[PDB]
């Protein structure tokens, strides 16, 4: 079914986003295991797998609505050297990514595009929801100090 | 373990190949259950998977040798339009792929850099694999038929 | 049990004919396999292991009889290159070796060796019925065509 | 996927010794349980199994490769006519054929086909294990008497 | 049904036959329990069971064939003192009385009596593998000599 | 079967150094625990058994190829007396302990002992993950303090 | 808990004695394996986990009572070049460390260390039993002879 071109043009962007969380988030992981923080790798692994389902959406909605999604680009990872810049990066990025998603959804609606709205507002929600688990461990990082933080993510 | 300058790059150079990999086969995928296609859907849908995996373990070899990953750089995808065409576009990823595997191999050989050349060598079979299944369905549509061969493709 | 001279020159007569059977089976059931046509594969895979059986009991037998069992002669190997000419030459090799074991059984009655007489028999119905089904594939190549016969042998 | 023409030749040498393998090791697992050694009959046959599964393992090697089988030469078969003698030539091949896989996977380090080499290195790990426990059967009827060893062979 | 006259005068001469071994071998298995050689005796015990199959075999079709069974007649029994002569005894029992179940399968065929033939190979089948477990036992008394194979049927 | 004389004297080598890290690890294990630091205690005691099969595999590859295993020169044990300097010591040790691994792997390669080289290959990967898991260790102590590390393994 | 200087100076005889016969038994054991004595095989690996099993309850001892274990001196092995020899071996040894064990007892009651006298009057026990099935096998050689004893170790 021939989608709307502004539409198309807004699931592409979201789509942007969501490959670039999944190697950062994928790359993060993976260094908290090289680290030995074993409960901080696993929790970033998920997200990781979670992003990539997000992709995997966006995906199938773009070919239906018959575009052509764009997994040739890939904007700037944000990797950082350490556990607290870590954090922070994927912070930043997950912040940065709302005003993009909640742009869509208002798009969606004034076109009357509303399966579109209703994906985008599942992604939404968990986006929001990994924001609250971020500013969560930055927070216990200052009230319990880095050193006791980064041993209750060893096992 | 600070690894081999020259080791770390060839990883990274994989690393690179693997990724693309991933995302060419991923959206080709998606094409394929789009067009109600399941069978090249699911098979193309792990193959996505296994390159996931592939990458992976050349990530959390190249931080173990005290290396920087590379997630950044994604080469050109070679998105096809149509089966045939997109089952060519996969064989001609993996057999531009093989130079790269085989020299990492013989480079890591030359410096005894034993472990990485068993990682490698483990991708190779693979590798060599997923080209077999590649030539056997072009090979099968010249026998059969394309038409068959999409037939025999939907369930 | 000295076993009669002319049966056991006729037991080892049919023994190499089974070896050719095994050897020519498990190359062509390989090539079907090779070629994606899964289905063919696993039967002629099967016929092959039914010869190495039959082998295996004219073996035995001879032995008994305490004659030499000779497994050093191989016969020409009636190799095909597509499908249509790989069922022709099965077909001809069961057939070209069906007067042998007929001719084993009339000798082995004349000089009552009953027992031979038996064992020959179970080979000379199971050999009939390998070549019902080569028959069968043939004609049917023939009612649905080459194209479908091939799409109906992959998986 | 073309392979090299030497390294297909190889492999169909090496293809040759399986099969005189198969056949030596089969009729001498025929002879002892014919003799009433079980023990000995119910190893050399699963000896010859493996030898089936090695030769099994080339043959599709070679065809995916690109090249062409070669089932129909079988070399000198060196049967025994007792214990001790066949013992002997079986260790006899066993050694004969070593000199044949590490040429094998020398060609194949030098040319670069690192998976046909991991494949012979498979069979190569085995080929020394049979090789062991013949000639762990020699020095053991040289401790205990030929008697005591046949003795114990028969259940 | 009333049968052939020639045809029940063999089947008679055939069950005289298998009288005869029920008893030797009857006597011979509890020889051999009593001097404690355990797996001698159970092996010939159940062919004793055999032989007695056999004649209730030979008893039902005669009786269907309307002829009169001979359960009076019994021939010499052939008692050996030693485990080799029993050996030898019951070898010479079974070799004995093969011509007269090839004489007895060429009459029935000769007179289109074939289910009487069935029955008779089915006989013969059986005692050519008695044969070969007795030619057996005598060859592995040669190879491991007499104190050895006694002390292997102990239990 | 007779192996290469130079090749025996490296595994010999090997095997020495296994012997050292087996009676380290053993008594390090027995400190931890003893120091109540249980899941240390743990990890380096089935780090001793690891070595201990190390140790193993070399013992029968060189009685198969027909050398004489060297269990009698223990060499320097390097003793620490507190959990950072026992990490270094056994880091030491296996770092010690790698160019003779790889030596060995090469020459093993060079006069053709390629089941040898697999042996070792085996080991160097073992060996390879013991140094990853001990970086690690001593790099969470400095990042997250002494106190809180031994903390953590206590159990 | 602060130990007596001259108990743990006997602890650690003690000790020595067992690393000896750990190496001595494991060692052995292989060879046997090697040689195909499987039954021989398994009980000489047995022992010498019990061994190790002695030797880690001694080490446990010393460090409870404040000393330190010493695993860097090893006595002299007394390796065998055939069965016979090596069961006298390990009986030499054996015997050589009772008068030892017996003084370590006798010096632990003198000064009231009676949990470590406890503790060396249950490895006692264990030696004891060794020794015991040593001269037992060493006099069932006598009496079956030698060929007989090793063809019942095969197994
Ligand atoms: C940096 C690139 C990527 C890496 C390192 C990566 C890695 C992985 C790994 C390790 C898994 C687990 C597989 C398993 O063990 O079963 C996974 C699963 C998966 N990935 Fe990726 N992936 C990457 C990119 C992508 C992209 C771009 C997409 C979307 C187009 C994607 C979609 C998926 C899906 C759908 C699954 C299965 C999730 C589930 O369990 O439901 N991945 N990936
Ligand atoms: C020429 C003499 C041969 C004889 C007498 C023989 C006999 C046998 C027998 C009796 C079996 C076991 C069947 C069963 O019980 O299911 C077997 C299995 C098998 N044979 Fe052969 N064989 C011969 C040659 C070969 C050759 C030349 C090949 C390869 C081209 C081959 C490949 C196999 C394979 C792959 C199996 C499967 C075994 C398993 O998966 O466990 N055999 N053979
Ligand atoms: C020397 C004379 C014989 C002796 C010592 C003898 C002894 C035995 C013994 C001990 C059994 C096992 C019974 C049980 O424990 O269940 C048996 C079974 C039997 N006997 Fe006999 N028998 C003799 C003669 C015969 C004869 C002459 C015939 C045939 C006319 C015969 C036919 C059978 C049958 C059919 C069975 C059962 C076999 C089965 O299990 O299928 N026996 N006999
Ligand atoms: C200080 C010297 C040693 C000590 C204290 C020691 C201690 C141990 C202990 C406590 C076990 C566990 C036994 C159980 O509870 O089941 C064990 C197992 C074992 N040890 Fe040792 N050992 C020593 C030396 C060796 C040596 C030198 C070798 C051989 C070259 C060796 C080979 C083995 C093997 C194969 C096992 C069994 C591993 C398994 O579970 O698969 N050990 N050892
Ligand atoms: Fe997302
Ligand atoms: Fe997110
Ligand atoms: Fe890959
Ligand atoms: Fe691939
Ligand atoms: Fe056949
Ligand atoms: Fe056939
Ligand atoms: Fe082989
Ligand atoms: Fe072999
Ligand atoms: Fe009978
Ligand atoms: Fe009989
Ligand atoms: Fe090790
Ligand atoms: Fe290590
Ligand atoms: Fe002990
Ligand atoms: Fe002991
Ligand atoms: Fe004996
Ligand atoms: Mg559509
Ligand atoms: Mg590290
Ligand atoms: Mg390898
Ligand atoms: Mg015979
Ligand atoms: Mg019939
Ligand atoms: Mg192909
Ligand atoms: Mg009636
Ligand atoms: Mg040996
Ligand atoms: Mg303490
Ligand atoms: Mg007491």
Redesign the interface.
């Known amino acids: 079914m021939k989608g709307d071109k502004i539409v198309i043009q807004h699931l592409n962007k979201i789509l942007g986003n969501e ?1 670039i969380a999944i ?2 988030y ?2 993060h992981a ?2 908290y ?4 923080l074993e409960k901080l790798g696993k929790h970033e692994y998920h997200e990781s797998i979670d992003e990539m389902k997000h992709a ?1 959406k966006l ?2 909605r773009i ?2 609505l018959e575009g052509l ?1 764009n ?2 680009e ?1 904007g ?2 944000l990797i950082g050297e350490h556990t607290k810049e870590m954090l922070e990066c994927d912070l930043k990025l997950e912040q940065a990514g709302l005003p993009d998603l909640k742009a869509a959804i208002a798009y969606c609606e004034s076109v009357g595009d509303y399966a579109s709205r209703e994906l985008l507002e599942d992604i939404l929600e968990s986006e929001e929801d990994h924001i609250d688990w971020l500013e969560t461990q930055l927070d216990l990082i200052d009230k319990i100090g880095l ?2 933080y ?2 209750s993510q ?2």
């Open positions: 490959l190697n950062q994928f790359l993976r260094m295991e090289d680290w030995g995997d995906i199938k070919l239906f999604p997994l040739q890939l700037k990872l050193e006791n980064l041993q060893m096992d």
